[PDB]
Ligand binder design. Sequence first.
Ligand SMILES: O=[N+]([O-])c1ccc(O[C@@H]2O[C@H](CO)[C@@H](O)[C@H](O)[C@@H]2O)cc1
Length: 153
Amino acid sequence: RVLDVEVYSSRSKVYVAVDGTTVLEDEAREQGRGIHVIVLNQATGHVMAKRVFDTYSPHEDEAMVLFLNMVAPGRVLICTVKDEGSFHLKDTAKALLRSLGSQAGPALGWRDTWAFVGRKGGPVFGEKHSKSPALSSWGDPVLLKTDVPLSSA
Ligand SMILES: O=[N+]([O-])c1ccc(O[C@@H]2O[C@H](CO)[C@@H](O)[C@H](O)[C@@H]2O)cc1
């Protein structure tokens, strides 16, 4: 079958809904900055892992690379940015995002918004990105809605 996946990225709020049900929601004012990553089972849509990496801060990108490298091929990966995710998103992490098929991830800039849904090992199912227009501003909120094919037993 399919999963209906909805992913939202903005300055102050992220959420992810799967089949109309909210599995992640973070609207807290000064918490949860960075790249939120959700891993779903590719047959059932069950949440395997939920992490946030504050890649505005040093060393979090290194943690994210270790984490993503251990995700099994075939898992569904969902990424979404809250506030800022680029400042300490360094070349190794960007290369990894590129390997996953992301076009916007490797190009992520200051206060850009970004939502991504893909299968580890490819293909990418959907991706949206809004560039911040100025250093004192954030990218526009992005709402990505995409259908994800499920694998069958
Ligand atoms: O002049 N500067 O280098 C500079 C000026 C203002 C800045 O604001 C910060 O930006 C972070 C990323 O958006 C927010 O998480 C944080 O809460 C705060 O708003 C950061 C840097």
